[PDB]
Scaffold this active site. Structure first.
Site, PDB file in Angstrom:
ATOM      1  N   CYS A 152      43.218  43.458   1.827  1.00 13.76           N
ATOM      2  CA  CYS A 152      44.379  42.711   2.277  1.00 13.76           C
ATOM      3  C   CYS A 152      44.680  41.450   1.481  1.00 13.76           C
ATOM      4  O   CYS A 152      45.811  40.966   1.492  1.00 13.76           O
ATOM      5  CB  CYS A 152      44.245  42.361   3.762  1.00 13.76           C
ATOM      6  SG  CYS A 152      42.831  41.290   4.173  1.00 13.76           S
ATOM      7  N   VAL A 156      48.471  40.435  -0.014  1.00 14.05           N
ATOM      8  CA  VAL A 156      49.156  39.203   0.358  1.00 14.05           C
ATOM      9  C   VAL A 156      49.698  38.442  -0.850  1.00 14.05           C
ATOM     10  O   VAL A 156      50.836  37.982  -0.831  1.00 14.05           O
ATOM     11  CB  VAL A 156      48.233  38.269   1.169  1.00 14.05           C
ATOM     12  CG1 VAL A 156      48.967  36.974   1.516  1.00 14.05           C
ATOM     13  CG2 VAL A 156      47.781  38.973   2.440  1.00 14.05           C
TER      14      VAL A 156
HETATM   15  S1  CLF Z   1      36.699  40.137   2.494  1.00 19.16           S
HETATM   16 FE1  CLF Z   1      35.578  39.390   4.438  1.00 19.16          FE
HETATM   17  S2  CLF Z   1      35.557  41.595   5.044  1.00 19.16           S
HETATM   18 FE2  CLF Z   1      37.241  41.902   3.587  1.00 19.16          FE
HETATM   19  S3  CLF Z   1      39.189  41.416   4.634  1.00 19.16           S
HETATM   20 FE3  CLF Z   1      38.359  39.428   3.747  1.00 19.16          FE
HETATM   21  S4  CLF Z   1      37.256  38.276   5.415  1.00 19.16           S
HETATM   22 FE4  CLF Z   1      37.412  40.526   5.847  1.00 19.16          FE
HETATM   23 FE5  CLF Z   1      38.882  42.851   6.482  1.00 19.16          FE
HETATM   24  S5  CLF Z   1      40.933  43.742   7.065  1.00 19.16           S
HETATM   25 FE6  CLF Z   1      40.054  45.438   5.795  1.00 19.16          FE
HETATM   26  S6  CLF Z   1      37.883  44.715   5.703  1.00 19.16           S
HETATM   27 FE7  CLF Z   1      38.982  43.685   3.982  1.00 19.16          FE
HETATM   28  S7  CLF Z   1      40.823  45.028   3.677  1.00 19.16           S
HETATM   29 FE8  CLF Z   1      41.300  43.140   4.825  1.00 19.16          FE
END
Ligand code: CLF
Ligand code: CLF
Ligand SMILES: [Ca+2]
Ligand SMILES: [Ca+2]
Lengths: 522, 405, 522, 405
Positions: A152, A156
């Site tokens: 994500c 963004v």
């Molecule tokens: S690095 Fe850490 S685990 Fe990755 S997102 Fe960012 S805070 Fe979370 Fe979350 S929702 Fe799925 S797992 Fe990612 S692509 Fe976005």
């Protein structure tokens, strides 16, 4: 304290009086805990109608969701192609979690890389990381293909995967002809199944889009099979086994069965089996294409129909009796191959089991949840058995999907008391199993917490959980099961009947109390 | 520096995993909100085994997953009005919670939302402690930064909540266990010893942590730190603003347990040092029987840890008590390295046991992490000893080669 | 009373206060029941060491045996040949029971006739009944073969099956060439497995004995497979599937898989599949003959070696890893066919599962019982997994068999605390699970009563039962399972691990009590 | 006469099945010994569902299997010394038993052993009631003879145990339920009605039977007989030696239940007839709701019973209350007969449901027998009604034909 002869782990270790008193002190003196009477009071309140009404009026809060994020699906799709390396453009954190989430469910190594974009890429885009990342991964793991998706963070700041990947072939970080298909897998859109959808489609285009004038619908005389997000290895196997039993030529597009079940003999195999590049390039020359799980293979559908010119049949997932009938009849009609005697016998043995077990299954109320296709397939089946679906929930579902299920429930006298919910979570479900109690629950490991909750209310309110779906962390090897076709219908029926039976046994085990009904024969 | 390059495999976590996963998640009476898309919280939901005692969903919420579950709309228009709304829903659906923390996921920092203001404003309104944590996953190159960010949040919004409160009745033996995640119950298994020794553990946080206990930490005389790597930050700070000293402690095996118990007592008078002896006497036979039973079946076995050199600078702990040979990773591959060294089990480093399993090598480290435990304290040694024996000596590892080549 | 909306069966119906009081009156006023304090007193006494010592000194009394009678085995053997009709010379009562006992375990129709010998035949022998009986059965059911056995009544008055059957062909009650093999199946000797033994041998002789000069060891280039008393349909299938996977030609002598699993489509099929007469007549022309369950195929062994001249290999039942290895290697050596890559991969996936689950299986104490081969095979397997067999019991076992098992236990560091018992029943076993408590029990449905007994003593003394063996009446479709080879080893391993896991879940479900260890991941 | 010829299939039982299986087996406080080879007792072990209340293995022994397990030696030298020895083992291992019966298996009669003497001698010695039953399986051509032999044994060794005892305090409403096997609980479900009606059921034997209750049967004023076919014998005899009248009763469906309840009351004064009315009033709505719910889904369905003609001489019971069409077997095949008549379910006769199932026809009779129950009384009607609907209307029967021929 411990006796070396019979050592105790956390359970029952911490039940020893010394630990109990030590914990009574911790609590009473420093936790400033609410009185136990208040706690029971609030708990009792969370099992009522009033709390349910309030619980269902949530708009901003999601508690205990029943869905993962897009890139999770992408990775599983990518992993199903020969020697390819799922690559995810974005933060390292996500990949740590994707692999960990599959390791737990499959108990196998899961190959997957990240190009760890940090704070600097948050302002200058992640162009560079894509460059070095593709090079080192192509070198270190020597793959034949790298399927790219995005976390994500990358979505963004909005990085262009197409350009980035071209500028990489440009400056010569990786060969020009080296397959590098991609797909934007927005975590804040849809769910993990959509991810599989965008990823598969993105791979189909890469190998097919620009070279459609040499293709002819019928050329290779095969039938394309698109599985969808499948977490039961037995499903890839069962479908290949039936097509091969009818003499139908086929090409299973995306087959991770091999890497997700590698033998143990001292050697670690990073790559194994999967859909070869050739099978993919030649996919358009197929008679037609069947989508095992339509409700989440829509984007793929559009492309297969508006580019390959295949009259993709409208078939539901082949689960249960009827839908396996249709899937089979439509495959016979498309390839000309008749249904062999063996498949007719297998259909008969399933009907045999259904009649051998119907007296225990009839009228049993079930609550269930999971993915769209899996859920409706399981609903269809529960109905064929005379069972009462009561609370059907699909967090990542939509309004069209819900009408389809509502119709299926109207086409049967067993769907009277059922209600389909979409966009609802397991905390919502928790209320439902309290206010309108079912006999059992069918879902993944996350439902074990709802069972513990209902049991706290009393033994007579406890709603046992039957583990079917994804993911399953608290039981081993259930991922080798099969839910599709006659084989999977038999396995599901067996799990259901014997659960009813074990639960009955449990309630009638009390000596000179309830054991008068502890029958040897059932 | 760590040149951990892109395009390579690593089960390395993010700032979120370090902040929500190890530092805040364990706090039992608080509700932690994964602010952002549905993924992070689902994958981390009850991932680590920080044991606790409570009534989940009513007064304890560790294994639950509260999320703002970001849709496209929220990313575009900001999730600030959403944050304010869900905080109100939490208040009515989970009335018995004692605080809320907001763990930021990647998107939160990028689309520039300001959770600090929402925290201050909603916190003032509901008279609750709302802790905003800027642990967006892309920040830094590991969980490490998450730990540091998670610690500052504790410091700035919780730690000094009762700096002007004196109604607290202290004793000369008040101690606080910081940084113990109570994996498999390690902290309870440790806290038992420290109290049989005359000490009064007023604060045990993270594992089976309580918001209330965090606020009392400054009211103690000594700070015991299990995991310095993630809690050292807040340890150094409590020594300046409050002048409270701190020390490391390790109860991995009988050698270290006795050692660290002696050292802890030393920071106090002599009656504690005497009690410390009555404790060591009481458990002497218990661990001896353990060494008597397993040392024979574990002797000569080489466990490889992720340390520089060929042998640890000192005693690791339990491995030595069981007569095991601890080796290192040299002074610098790693996959072939292990094939050529052929250890009996990997004790730590470069995670993911499943890869090693395929290579015929056991992978069970210092902490429970996945199935048994506790592994610390005297009671933990027996458990550790039994598991070591079952893993090392199980007949499954001797069947990798089929008898027909 | 009853609410039509939620009707109640015996359970919980009779728990309503009105039934409870009505039963309190019945008891207190007319049953002259012993005081509840006396009953608890005696119960407590039946769980002690003193009672065990006394219990083991029985010589005349058998309580809760773990074995059936010979003719039961005969019938199952007979049923495995094409269009043949198991016929039992003796009382009608026995057949009523044989069919009923198989219907319950297989939940399928079981064909079997009697020549209902009454009081008159008790003095004038059963010669006449044999005459009319063979004629009406040959006419009514139009079989191609009739395998005859005897109930204990016929054995006591001592009727000659050979003569009787000849005098029937003599007076012309049935054609001369119509196959009518026989065997004396003394119910007061051995058990149901011996029955299968005498019956199979009696059929092998009938088709082979007088015509051995035309046979040549190697002629048909196949390998004879003799299953033995098998009640798991998955075992006949798994073995045929592996031989066919190696390219080895074979002849499964006695295959009831077909009639015991007929499709459901409106038609009742009395006969189905099975070993044809030709395959039997040509059996001597085989390369060799393998006996899947040696310990109860001794009489068959003698005949195969002293008449067919086959060097029957000394192989244990192919259960578990090692014994499936040996069975496979010896089959490769006898037919020249090498072990295919697929079977090597399957062996690796089993080893993979063993390593994925070993932390839950290691050190678990098990009590078990069943038939000789099945038991030792299961013992071998439990040991390969690092488990502790503790009470091994085999009612129909012998001293030689016991030494074989005792040796297998000495060849492993996990058989230290084990003890093998023969000629002991389930009442004996009941004491053992009280005085030296195991974690689980592996056996048939009859063990459910021992679990209810142990639970009455307390939750912490309860010994859960894992249903494996014969017969299984209180669960449906478990007879389709597989216990042989890698496939069956995987299925057994899965049942064991998930039982440990479900039981753990159950003990850690109590809110704010033991749930601190109710892990999502296990 | 029944020309049931050899070489034909029939799930017809033997004298042993009738004596041990239905008449003696149910008696809960007695230990029944299958005298002979191991088979008979194992196959019959907990085969029928005669519900009871007790502590199995301590004071109740219905689902257990005690056997003399005859080896070759016993057949040759006789099992008399063995019988005497095992009776002594039973006495020490099951002290709380109130009697022993000896059910003879085929071999016992043939090798000419005399269990009568052992009974008399051991019985006198241990001051217990030991009942020898000569129910060798070859005797007669059905269970029927077993029933008759089992009844005479009751008569000769149990029934008159207290013919010179008067300490029994009787009432004018003492009744005894004879021949109810309490299948699925039928007898309890019946006994409830009879007592809400003012009667006092002193003896209920076989099902949930007690040895003590058998001995009091002669002290009653009326004998209610459920299954005449197996208990009529002992019924006629109690009328001559004691002058106690007897009548049949049937609580299968509301019609018969009301009918038989009326008739029972008639044998008594008017207060019972009034109570009988209060009972019928109390359950009126309950069965009406049952007919309201299921009659619609069962109406027009034809259940075939094993009766002569095309329709029963009178009301069968529950089938009619649910608007079902009961047909007969004509006046004389049987397999094809059913194919040509195509019923909706076979209500009784020529057992073995599995054959019919293959033919697409349900087979669930008058009694529980296998899975649910009770089916008698008012509470039993609802249960029967629900099961009928689930079996008749289950979608499995409509799937026999594959959609591709
Ligand atoms: S690095 Fe850490 S685990 Fe990755 S997102 Fe960012 S805070 Fe979370 Fe979350 S929702 Fe799925 S797992 Fe990612 S692509 Fe976005
Ligand atoms: S007719 Fe009736 S059931 Fe048959 S024996 Fe006779 S009393 Fe009994 Fe028993 S042991 Fe086996 S089943 Fe028979 S062959 Fe002998
Ligand atoms: Ca694995
Ligand atoms: Ca069947």
């Amino acid at each position: 304290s411990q006796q070396v002869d019979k050592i105790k782990a956390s359970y029952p270790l911490f039940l020893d009086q010394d630990y109990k008193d030590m914990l009574a002190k911790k609590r009473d003196g420093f936790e400033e805990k609410y009185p136990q009477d208040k706690i029971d009071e609030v708990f009792q309140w969370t099992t009522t109608k009033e709390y349910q009404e309030l619980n269902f009026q949530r708009e901003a809060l999601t508690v205990n969701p029943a869905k993962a994020c897009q890139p999770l699906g992408a990775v599983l799709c990518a992993l199903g192609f020969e020697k390819t390396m799922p690559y995810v453009h974005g933060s390292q954190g996500c990949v740590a979690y994707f692999r960990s989430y599959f390791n737990r469910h499959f108990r196998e190594p899961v190959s997957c890389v990240s190009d760890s974009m940090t704070e600097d890429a948050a302002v200058f885009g992640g162009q560079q990381n894509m460059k070095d990342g593709l090079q080192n991964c192509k070198a270190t793991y020597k793959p034949d293909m790298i399927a790219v998706s995005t976390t994500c963070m990358a979505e963004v700041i909005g990085d262009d995967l197409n350009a980035f990947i071209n500028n990489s072939k440009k400056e010569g970080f990786i060969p020009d002809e080296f397959p590098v298909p991609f797909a934007h897998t927005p975590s804040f859109v849809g769910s993990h199944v959509t991810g599989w959808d965008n990823m598969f489609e993105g791979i189909a285009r890469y190998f097919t889009l620009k070279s459609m004038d040499d293709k002819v619908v019928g050329s290779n005389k095969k039938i394309n099979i698109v599985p969808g997000f499948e977490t039961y290895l037995g499903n890839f196997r069962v479908i290949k086994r039936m097509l091969s039993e009818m003499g139908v030529g086929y090409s299973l597009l995306s087959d991770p069965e091999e890497v997700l079940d590698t033998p143990a003999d001292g050697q670690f195999r990073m790559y194994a089996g999967g859909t070869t590049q050739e099978e993919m390039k030649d996919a358009p020359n197929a008679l037609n294409t069947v989508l095992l799980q339509p409700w989440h293979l829509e984007k793929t559908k559009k492309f297969v129909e508006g580019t390959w010119k295949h009259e993709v049949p409208k078939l539901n997932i082949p689960m249960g009796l009827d839908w396996t009938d249709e899937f089979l009849m439509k495959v016979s009609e498309i390839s000309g191959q008749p249904i062999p005697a063996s498949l007719t016998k297998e259909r008969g043995r399933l009907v045999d089991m259904m009649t051998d077990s119907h007296t225990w299954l009839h009228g049993k109320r079930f609550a269930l949840w999971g993915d769209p296709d899996f859920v409706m397939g399981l609903v269809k089946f529960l109905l064929e058995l005379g069972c009462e679906p009561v609370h059907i929930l699909c967090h990542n579902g939509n309004k069209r999907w819900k009408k389809a299920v509502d119709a299926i429930l109207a086409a049967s006298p067993y769907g009277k008391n059922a209600t389909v919910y979409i966009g609802k979570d397991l905390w919502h479900l928790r209320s439902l199993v309290f206010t309108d109690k079912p006999d059992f629950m069918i879902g993944n490991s996350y439902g074990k917490f709802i069972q513990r909750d209902t049991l706290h209310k009393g033994k007579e309110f406890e709603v046992p959980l039957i583990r079917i779906g994804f993911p399953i962390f608290d039981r081993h090897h259930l991922h080798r099961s099969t839910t599709l076709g006659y084989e999977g219908a038999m396995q599901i029926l067996t799990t259901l009947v014997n659960s009813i039976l074990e639960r009955l046994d449990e309630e009638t085990r009390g000596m000179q109390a309830t054991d008068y009904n502890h029958d040897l024969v059932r | 520096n760590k040149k951990s390059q892109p395009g390579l495999m690593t089960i390395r976590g993010c700032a979120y995993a370090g902040s929500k996963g190890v530092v805040w998640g364990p706090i039992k009476d608080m509700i932690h909100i994964s602010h952002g898309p549905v993924g992070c919280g689902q994958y981390s939901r009850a991932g680590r085994r920080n044991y606790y005692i409570g009534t989940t969903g009513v007064n304890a919420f560790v294994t639950m997953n509260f999320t703002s579950d970001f849709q496209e709309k929220d990313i575009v228009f900001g999730g600030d009005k959403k944050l304010a709304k869900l905080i109100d829903e939490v208040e009515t659906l989970f009335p018995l919670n004692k605080g809320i923390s907001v763990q930021s996921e990647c998107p939160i920092g990028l689309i520039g939302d300001d959770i600090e203001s929402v925290s201050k404003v909603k916190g003032a309104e509901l008279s609750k402690t709302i802790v905003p944590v800027r642990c967006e996953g892309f920040r830094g190159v590991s969980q490490s930064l998450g730990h540091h960010i998670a610690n500052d949040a504790v410091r700035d919004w919780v730690l000094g909540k009762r700096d002007e409160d004196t109604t607290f009745a202290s004793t000369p033996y008040d101690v606080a266990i910081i940084g113990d995640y109570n994996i498999g119950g390690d902290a309870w298994s440790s806290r038992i010893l420290l109290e049989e020794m005359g000490l009064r553990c007023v604060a045990q946080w993270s594992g089976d942590g309580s918001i209330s206990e965090i606020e009392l930490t400054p009211k103690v005389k000594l700070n015991l730190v299990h995991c310095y790597r993630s809690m050292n930050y807040i340890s150094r700070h409590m020594e300046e603003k409050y002048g409270i000293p701190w020390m490391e402690y390790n109860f991995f095996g009988p050698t270290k347990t006795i050692e660290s118990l002696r050292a802890i007592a030393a920071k106090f008078d002599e009656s504690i040092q005497k009690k410390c002896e009555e404790v060591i006497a009481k458990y002497k036979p218990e661990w001896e029987a353990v060494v008597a039973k397993y040392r024979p079946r574990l002797e000569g076995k080489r466990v490889m840890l992720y340390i520089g050199g060929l042998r640890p600078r000192h005693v690791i702990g339990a491995y030595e008590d069981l007569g095991m040979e601890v080796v290192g990773t040299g002074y610098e591959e790693f996959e072939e390295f292990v094939k050529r060294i052929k250890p009996d089990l990997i004790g730590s480093g470069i995670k993911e046991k499943f890869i090693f399993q395929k290579m015929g090598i056991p992978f069970r480290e210092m902490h429970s992490w996945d199935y048994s435990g506790p592994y610390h304290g005297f009671d933990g040694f027996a458990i550790f000893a039994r598991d070591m024996d079952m893993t090392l000596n199980n007949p499954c590892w001797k069947k990798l080669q089929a008898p027909w080549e």
